[PDB]
């Protein structure tokens, strides 16, 4: 007769819940070691064997997450601009086509 059904939050509730979770966190998101490596291969191209402090990396990250959370933010406004809740690659592009990096 009555068959079970698991308790699944509707698409979007878990979303907004972790939005409120993450907009109160100040902790960095991109993980450290993965990021650190991002550089050693993004630097090896500019100068060989450039050592890096454990603070340059942390800085070059804080500066990155900060740059990205800003761009995502203008991406969203750009996504809402077309009356849509999905962001698209064009958005990150319109946004950046207006900051003048493109």
């Amino acid at each position: 007769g009555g068959v079970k059904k698991p308790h699944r939050y509707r698409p979007g509730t878990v979303a907004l819940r972790e939005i409120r979770r993450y907009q109160k966190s100040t902790e960095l998101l991109i993980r450290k070691l993965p990021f650190q490596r991002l550089v050693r291969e993004i630097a090896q191209d500019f100068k060989t064997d450039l050592r890096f402090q454990s603070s340059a990396v942390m800085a070059l990250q804080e500066a990155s997450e900060a740059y990205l959370v800003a761009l995502f933010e203008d991406t969203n406004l750009a996504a809402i601009h077309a009356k849509r809740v999905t962001i698209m690659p064009k958005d990150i592009q319109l946004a950046r086509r207006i900051r003048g990096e493109r």
């Binding site: 907004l16 409120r20 100040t26 500066a63 740059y67 959370v69 809402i80």
Partner: protein, 106 residues
């Protein structure tokens, strides 16, 4: 007995230091006596409004000390300090909590 220039000016920030710096900064050839006094006066003010606003923020989160986070709230909540510190990215700030109205459930 030698008194300091800050107590002459009634300030807490150092007026002496801000003279040296002004001099070695070579911002200009000659620097007058009152220029470091005024700058220390403005710097302490800006350091104060920002510290006050941070104090208003902290007590709210019931935290004794002032962690870097509070400093972002203070700066992004205020609409002046935000034009000033507007292309500045503070360490461990997070972002002002905000979600768009169309993203809310109906």
């Amino acid at each position: 007995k030698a008194k300091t220039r800050s107590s002459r000016a009634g300030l807490q920030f150092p007026v002496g230091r801000v003279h040296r710096l002004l001099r070695k900064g070579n911002y200009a050839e000659r620097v007058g006596a009152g220029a470091p006094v005024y700058l220390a006066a403005v710097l302490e003010y800006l350091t104060a409004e920002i510290l006050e606003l941070a104090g208003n923020a902290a007590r709210d989160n019931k935290k004794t000390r002032i962690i870097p986070r509070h400093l972002q709230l203070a700066v992004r909540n205020d609409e002046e300090l935000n034009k000033l510190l507007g292309r500045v990215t503070i360490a461990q700030g997070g972002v002002l909590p905000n979600i768009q109205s169309v993203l809310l459930p109906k």
